[PDB]
Amino acid sequence: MVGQLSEGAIAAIMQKGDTNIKPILQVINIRPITTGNSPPRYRLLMSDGLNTLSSFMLATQLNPLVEEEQLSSNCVCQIHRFIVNTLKDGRRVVILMELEVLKSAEAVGVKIGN
Numbered sequence: 001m002v003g004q005l006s007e008g009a010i011a012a013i014m015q016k017g018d019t020n021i022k023p024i025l026q027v028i029n030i031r032p033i034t035t036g037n038s039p040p041r042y043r044l045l046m047s048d049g050l051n052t053l054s055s056f057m058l059a060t061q062l063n064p065l066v067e068e069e070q071l072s073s074n075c076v077c078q079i080h081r082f083i084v085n086t087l088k089d090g091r092r093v094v095i096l097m098e099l100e101v102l103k104s105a106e107a108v109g110v111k112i113g114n
Contacts, residue, residue, distance in 0.1 A: 010048045023078040023101045024048030027071030031057075044071060056082045056094035070096075072106040 005012075006024065013022040029045030031054065042061055045054035056079070061070045069075075081097030 006049045010050045013048060014051065020080075022048070024076060025079045025099070025101070026074050026076035026105065028052060028074060029054065030067075030071055042067075053094070055092040056084065056096045058083070058093075058095035059097060061096065069104065072104070073108045074106065075102060076105040077101045077103045 009021070009024050013024070025046050025048065027044060028047040029052075031043040031045060033039065033041030033043060042057055043054060044057040044061070045052055046056065047053070059082075060066060063069075077099030078101040079096055079098060080100045083093075083095035083097070085094070086092040
């Protein structure tokens with residue numbers, strides 16, 4: 001009928017204090033840290049449709065196909081938990097815990113048939 005709560009969700013996520021109201025955590029970008037002369041890291045870019053963050057990316061996403069599942073083609077999910085901790089207020093360090101929404105809204109997969 002009329003959802004896509006975006007003209008109130010994003011502001012309701014950072015303004016509500018993130019009190020279980022963030023049904024817009026989709027993968028819009030990715031940042032693999034496996035270049036030479038550098039440690040193994042996996043920073044991804046998450047957004048809701050206006051304000052992005054890309055600071056919470058340290059959960060079980062290290063899996064093999066969890067890169068394809070944690071962001072196959074822009075899947076929206078409502079994370080339920082996450083370790084939010086900034087390092088000196090500069091090198092922020094957030095981690096993802098779980099998801100709570102399409103949890104796989106690639107919008108392209110969805111196997112239908114039979």
